[PDB]
Amino acid sequence: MSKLEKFTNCYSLSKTLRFKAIPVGKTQENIDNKRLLVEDEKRAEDYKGVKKLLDRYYLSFINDVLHSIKLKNLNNYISLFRKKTRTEKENKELENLEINLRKEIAKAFKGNEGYKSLFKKDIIETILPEFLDDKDEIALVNSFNGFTTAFTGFFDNRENMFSEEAKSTSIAFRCINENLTRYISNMDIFEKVDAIFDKHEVQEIKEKILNSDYDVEDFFEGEFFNFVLTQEGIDVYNAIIGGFVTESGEKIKGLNEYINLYNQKTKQKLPKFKPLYKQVLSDEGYTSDEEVLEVFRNTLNKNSEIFSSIKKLEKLFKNFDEYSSAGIFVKNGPAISTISKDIFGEWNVIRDKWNAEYDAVVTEKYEDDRRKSFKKIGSFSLEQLQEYADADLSVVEKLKEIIIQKVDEIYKVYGSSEKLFDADFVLEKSLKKNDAVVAIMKDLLDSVKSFENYIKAFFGEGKETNRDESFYGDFVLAYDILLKVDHIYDAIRNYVTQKPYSKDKFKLYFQNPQFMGGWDKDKETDYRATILRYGSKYYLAIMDKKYAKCLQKIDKDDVNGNYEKINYKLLPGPNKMLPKVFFSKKWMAYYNPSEDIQKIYKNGTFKKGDMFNLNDCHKLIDFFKDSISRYPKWSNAYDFNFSETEKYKDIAGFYREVEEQGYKVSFESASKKEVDKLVEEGKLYMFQIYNKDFSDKSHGTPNLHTMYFKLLFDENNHGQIRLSGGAELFMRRASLKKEELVVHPANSPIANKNPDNPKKTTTLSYDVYKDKRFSEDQYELHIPIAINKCPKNIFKINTEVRVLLKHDDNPYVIGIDRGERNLLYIVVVDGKGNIVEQYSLNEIINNFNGIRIKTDYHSLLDKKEKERFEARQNWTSIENIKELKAGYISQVVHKICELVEKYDAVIALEDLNSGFKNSRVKVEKQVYQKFEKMLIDKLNYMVDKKSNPCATGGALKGYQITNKFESFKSMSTQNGFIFYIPAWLTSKIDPSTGFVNLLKTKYTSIADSKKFISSFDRIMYVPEEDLFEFALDYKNFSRTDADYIKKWKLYSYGNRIRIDWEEVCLTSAYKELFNKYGINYQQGDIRALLCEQSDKAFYSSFMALMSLMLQMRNSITGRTDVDFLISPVKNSDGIFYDSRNYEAQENAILPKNADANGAYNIARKVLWAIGQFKKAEDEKLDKVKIAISNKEWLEYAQTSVK
RNA sequence: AAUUUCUACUAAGUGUAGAUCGCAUCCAGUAAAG
DNA sequence: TTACTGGATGCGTAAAGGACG
DNA sequence: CGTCCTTTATT
Ligand SMILES: [Mg+2]
- What string of DSSP letters covers A1049-1115? EEE--SEEEE---EEEEHHHHHHHHHHHTT--TTSSB-HHHHHH---HHHHHHHHHHHHHHT--B--
What is the DSSP-derived secondary structure letter of residue A957? B
Pair A830, A810: CB distance under 8 Å: yes
Q: Which residue among the candidates A200, A546, A753, A1202 is catalytic per the annotation?
A: A753
Chain mean position to CA A537: 38
Q: How many CA atoms lie within 13 A of A960 on its CB side?
A: 22
Strands A13-23 and A684-690: antiparallel
| Number of C-beta neighbours around residue A74 at 10 A | 18
Cis peptide before A957 (omega within 30 of 0): no
Task: Show Cβ contacts of residue A947 under 8 Å, excluding neighbours closer than 6 positions.
Answer: A953, A954, A955
Q: What are phi and psi of A48, to 5 degrees?
A: -65, -30
Pair A836, A828: CB distance under 8 Å: yes
Say if A501 falls within a structural domain: no
Coil vs helix vs strand at A480 = helix
Closest CA to A1133 of A1202, A1055, A1182: A1202
Pair A1042, A998: CB distance under 8 Å: yes
Q: Which nucleotide is nearest to A124 (CA to C1')?
A: D6
A942 by Cβ neighbours in 10 Å (0-12 / 13-18 / 19+) ranks as buried
Pair A225, A233: CB distance under 8 Å: no
Q: Which residue among the candidates A468, A817, A820, A1043 is catalytic per the annotation?
A: A817
| Number of C-beta neighbours around residue A186 at 10 A | 21
Query: Which helix (H) or strand (E) segment is A507 a member of?
Result: strand A506-507
- For residues A752 and A766, give the distance between their C-alpha atoms in angstroms, rounded to a whole number: 17
**What residues pair up with A1119 in beta bridges, in sequence order?**
A1116
Pair A977, A961: CB distance under 8 Å: yes
Torsion of CA A1044, A1049, A1053, A1055, to 10 degrees: 50
CA of A573, C1' of D9: distance in angstroms: 9
- For residues A259 and A268, give the distance between their C-alpha atoms in angstroms, rounded to a whole number: 10
Helix axes A395-416, A305-318, angle to 10 degrees: 150
Task: Show Cβ contacts of residue A101 under 8 Å, excluding neighbours closer than 6 positions.
Answer: A71, A72, A73, A74, A77, A172, A175, A176, A180
What is the DSSP-derived secondary structure letter of residue A942? B
Q: Which nucleotide is nearest to A578 (CA to C1')?
A: D9
A1092 by Cβ neighbours in 10 Å (0-12 / 13-18 / 19+) ranks as exposed
Q: How far is CA A1156 from CA A717, A991, A1130, A1159, in A?
A: 43, 10, 20, 5
What is the DSSP-derived secondary structure letter of residue A438? H
CA of A703 to the centre of ligand 1 (A): 5
Pair A1167, A1193: CB distance under 8 Å: no
Pair A516, A527: CB distance under 8 Å: yes
Q: How far is CA A151 from CA A44, A117, A411, A445, in A?
A: 12, 14, 55, 44
- For residues A315 and A111, give the distance between their C-alpha atoms in angstroms, rounded to a whole number: 64
Query: Nearest residue (Cα to C1') for C3?
Result: A926
Q: Which nucleotide is nearest to A655 (CA to C1')?
A: D11
**What residues pair up with A1032 in beta bridges, in sequence order?**
A1048
Q: Which nucleotide is nearest to A522 (CA to C1')?
A: C14
Query: Nearest residue (Cα to C1') for B5?
Result: A18
Closest CA to A1186 of A911, A974, A912: A974
Chain B positions with any atom < 7 A from a protein CB: 1-29, 32-34
Q: Which residue among the candidates A616, A990, A1155, A1195 is catalytic per the annotation?
A: A1155
Q: How far is CA A909 from CA A829, A906, A913, A973, A1163, in A?
A: 14, 10, 12, 10, 8
Task: Show Cβ contacts of residue A741 under 8 Å, excluding neighbours closer than 6 positions.
Answer: A769, A770, A771, A772, A775
CA of A693 to the centre of ligand 1 (A): 7
Helix and strand counts by DSSP (H, E) for chain A: 45, 33
- For residues A968 and A460, give the distance between their C-alpha atoms in angstroms, rounded to a whole number: 32
Coil vs helix vs strand at A209 = coil
- Domains: count for chain A: 8
> Within this chain, do residues A726 and A749 fall inside the same structural domain, yes or no?
no
Pair A1148, A835: CB distance under 8 Å: yes
Question: Could you give the maximum distance between any two Cα atoms of chain A, in Å?
Answer: 113
Say if A1155 falls within a structural domain: no
Chain mean position to CA A1049: 46
> Within this chain, do residues A532 and A559 fall inside the same structural domain, yes or no?
yes
Over its C-alpha atoms, chain A yields an Rg (Å, rounded) of 37
Task: Show Cβ contacts of residue A912 under 8 Å, excluding neighbours closer than 6 positions.
Answer: A925, A928, A929, A932, A968, A971, A980
Query: Which helix (H) or strand (E) segment is A542 a member of?
Result: strand A537-543
CA of A553, C1' of D3: distance in angstroms: 17
> Within this chain, do residues A258 and A389 fall inside the same structural domain, yes or no?
no
> Within this chain, do residues A424 and A558 fall inside the same structural domain, yes or no?
no
Instruction: Please give the span between the terminal C-alpha atoms of chain A, in angstroms, as a whole number.
Output: 30
CA of A698 to the centre of ligand 1 (A): 8
Q: How far is CA A741 from CA A430, A500, A592, A735, A838, in A?
A: 14, 11, 71, 11, 45
- For residues A98 and A180, give the distance between their C-alpha atoms in angstroms, rounded to a whole number: 10
Q: How many residues are present in chain A?
A: 1202
Q: Name the structure determination technique.
A: X-ray
Pair A830, A836: CB distance under 8 Å: yes
Chain mean position to CA A144: 38
Query: Residue type for A761, please?
Result: T
**What residues pair up with A540 in beta bridges, in sequence order?**
A531, A687
CA-based torsion, A345, A347, A350, A352: positive or negative: negative
What is the DSSP-derived secondary structure letter of residue A923? S
Catalytic site includes residue A95: no
> Within this chain, do residues A1038 and A905 fall inside the same structural domain, yes or no?
no
Strands A684-690 and A778-787: unpaired
> Within this chain, do residues A561 and A585 fall inside the same structural domain, yes or no?
no
What is the DSSP-derived secondary structure letter of residue A1157? H
Pair A731, A41: CB distance under 8 Å: yes
> Within this chain, do residues A947 and A1073 fall inside the same structural domain, yes or no?
no
Query: Nearest residue (Cα to C1') for B21?
Result: A15
Closest CA to A4 of A894, A845, A977, A929: A977
Torsion of CA A258, A262, A263, A267, to 10 degrees: 160
CA of A714, C1' of C14: distance in angstroms: 24
Query: Residue type for A197, please?
Result: F
Say if A777 falls within a structural domain: yes
| Number of C-beta neighbours around residue A941 at 10 A | 23
- For residues A803 and A3, give the distance between their C-alpha atoms in angstroms, rounded to a whole number: 10
- For residues A621 and A619, give the distance between their C-alpha atoms in angstroms, rounded to a whole number: 5
Say if A155 falls within a structural domain: no
Say if A1119 falls within a structural domain: no
- For residues A19 and A706, give the distance between their C-alpha atoms in angstroms, rounded to a whole number: 9
Strands A825-829 and A813-817: antiparallel
Say if A237 falls within a structural domain: yes
Closest CA to A634 of A548, A726, A530, A520: A520
Query: Residue type for A713, please?
Result: F
CA of A709 to the centre of ligand 1 (A): 15
Pair A313, A407: CB distance under 8 Å: yes
Chain D positions with any atom < 7 A from a protein CB: 3-11
For strand C, is any atom closer than 7 Å to the CB of A705? Answer: no
CA of A503, C1' of B13: distance in angstroms: 29
Q: Which of A449, A471, A496 is the last residue of a domain?
A: A496
- For residues A894 and A1160, give the distance between their C-alpha atoms in angstroms, rounded to a whole number: 20
> Within this chain, do residues A318 and A222 fall inside the same structural domain, yes or no?
no
| Number of C-beta neighbours around residue A423 at 10 A | 6
Q: Which residue among the candidates A432, A744, A988, A1000 is catalytic per the annotation?
A: A744
CA of A729, C1' of C12: distance in angstroms: 14
- For residues A68 and A550, give the distance between their C-alpha atoms in angstroms, rounded to a whole number: 55
- For residues A165 and A175, give the distance between their C-alpha atoms in angstroms, rounded to a whole number: 12
Q: Which range marks the domain in which residue A139 is found?
A: 36-147
- For residues A147 and A554, give the distance between their C-alpha atoms in angstroms, rounded to a whole number: 30
Q: What are phi and psi of A1051, to 5 degrees?
A: -140, 140
CA of A864 to the centre of ligand 1 (A): 27
CA of A446, C1' of B5: distance in angstroms: 34
Q: Which nucleotide is nearest to A518 (CA to C1')?
A: C13
CA angle A1041, A1047, A1051 (to 5 degrees): 120
Long-range own/partner contacts, residues A481-487 (CB < 8 A, 24 or more apart)? A481/A305, A481/A306, A481/A308, A481/A309, A482/A306, A482/A309, A482/A310, A482/A313, A482/A448, A482/A452, A482/A455, A483/A452, A484/A299, A484/A305, A484/A306, A485/A299, A485/A300, A485/A306, A485/A445, A485/A448, A485/A449, A485/A452, A486/A449, A486/A452
Query: Residue type for A244, please?
Result: F
Q: How far is CA A97 from CA A103, A225, A279, A375, A619, in A?
A: 10, 15, 22, 39, 37
For strand C, is any atom closer than 7 Å to the CB of A338? Answer: yes
CA-based torsion, A923, A929, A935, A941: positive or negative: negative
Torsion of CA A1141, A1145, A1148, A1150, to 10 degrees: 20
> Within this chain, do residues A815 and A868 fall inside the same structural domain, yes or no?
yes
Task: Show Cβ contacts of residue A941 under 8 Å, excluding neighbours closer than 6 positions.
Answer: A13, A15, A787, A788, A958, A959, A960
Closest CA to A417 of A504, A293, A322: A293
Task: Show Cβ contacts of residue A154 under 8 Å, excluding neighbours closer than 6 positions.
Answer: A51, A54
Pair A709, A665: CB distance under 8 Å: no
Q: Which of A441, A465, A496 is the last residue of a domain?
A: A496
Q: Which nucleotide is nearest to A121 (CA to C1')?
A: D6
Query: Residue type for A124, please?
Result: I
Residue A1147 Ramachandran class (φ > 0 left, ψ -120 to 50 alpha, else beta): beta
Q: Return residues with beta carbons within 7 A of strand D.
A: A 116, 120-122, 145-149, 152, 511-514, 525-526, 545-546, 548-549, 573, 575-577, 579-580, 607-608, 650-652, 655-656
CA of A45, C1' of D10: distance in angstroms: 34
Task: Show Cβ contacts of residue A879 under 8 Å, excluding neighbours closer than 6 positions.
Answer: A497
For strand C, is any atom closer than 7 Å to the CB of A156? Answer: yes
A701 belongs to an annotated ligand binding site: yes
Q: Helix, strand, coil proportions of chain A in percent (round to 5)?
A: 45, 15, 40
CA angle A737, A740, A745 (to 5 degrees): 120
DSSP assignment of A1021-1038: EETTTTEEEEEEEGGGSS
A545-567 CB burial, b ≥16 within 10 A, e <16: eeebebbeebeebeeeebbbbbb
CA angle A115, A121, A125 (to 5 degrees): 105
A297-323 CB burial, b ≥16 within 10 A, e <16: eeebbeebebbebbebbbebbeebeeb
| Number of C-beta neighbours around residue A385 at 10 A | 23
- For residues A243 and A209, give the distance between their C-alpha atoms in angstroms, rounded to a whole number: 8
CA of A955, C1' of B16: distance in angstroms: 21
CA of A173 to the centre of ligand 1 (A): 48
A108-124 CB burial, b ≥16 within 10 A, e <16: bbeeeeebeebbeeebb
**What residues pair up with A330 in beta bridges, in sequence order?**
A380
Closest CA to A233 of A207, A213, A261: A213
Coil vs helix vs strand at A600 = helix
Coil vs helix vs strand at A296 = helix
Long-range own/partner contacts, residues A256-263 (CB < 8 A, 24 or more apart)? A258/A196, A258/A197, A258/A198, A258/A201, A259/A193, A259/A196, A260/A462, A260/A463, A262/A196, A263/A463
CA of A752 to the centre of ligand 1 (A): 19
Pair A1016, A1110: CB distance under 8 Å: no
3-state secondary structure A707-752: HHHHHCCCCCCCCCEEECCCCEEEEECCCCCHHHCCEECCCCCEEC
Say if A555 falls within a structural domain: yes
Catalytic site includes residue A770: yes
Q: How far is CA A398 from CA A319, A716, A779, in A?
A: 13, 78, 64
Closest CA to A149 of A508, A515, A510: A515
> Within this chain, do residues A981 and A865 fall inside the same structural domain, yes or no?
yes
| Number of C-beta neighbours around residue A585 at 10 A | 7
Task: Show Cβ contacts of residue A667 under 8 Å, excluding neighbours closer than 6 positions.
Answer: A533, A564, A565, A566, A567, A713
| Number of C-beta neighbours around residue A24 at 10 A | 18
Coil vs helix vs strand at A91 = helix
> Within this chain, do residues A433 and A354 fall inside the same structural domain, yes or no?
yes
- For residues A889 and A616, give the distance between their C-alpha atoms in angstroms, rounded to a whole number: 55
**What residues pair up with A847 in beta bridges, in sequence order?**
A852
Query: Residue type for A945, please?
Result: K
CA of A602, C1' of D9: distance in angstroms: 14
Catalytic site includes residue A858: no
Which positions 361-380 on chain A have a beta carbon less than 7 angstroms from any atom of strand C? none
Chain mean position to CA A751: 38
CA-based torsion, A120, A121, A126, A130: positive or negative: positive
- For residues A64 and A68, give the distance between their C-alpha atoms in angstroms, rounded to a whole number: 7
Pair A906, A1165: CB distance under 8 Å: no
**What residues pair up with A1134 in beta bridges, in sequence order?**
none
CA of A921, C1' of B31: distance in angstroms: 20
Resolution in angstroms comes to 4.0
| Number of C-beta neighbours around residue A223 at 10 A | 11
> Within this chain, do residues A58 and A120 fall inside the same structural domain, yes or no?
yes
Catalytic site includes residue A192: no
Say if A526 falls within a structural domain: yes
Q: Which nucleotide is nearest to A149 (CA to C1')?
A: D6
Coil vs helix vs strand at A663 = strand
- For residues A395 and A391, give the distance between their C-alpha atoms in angstroms, rounded to a whole number: 10
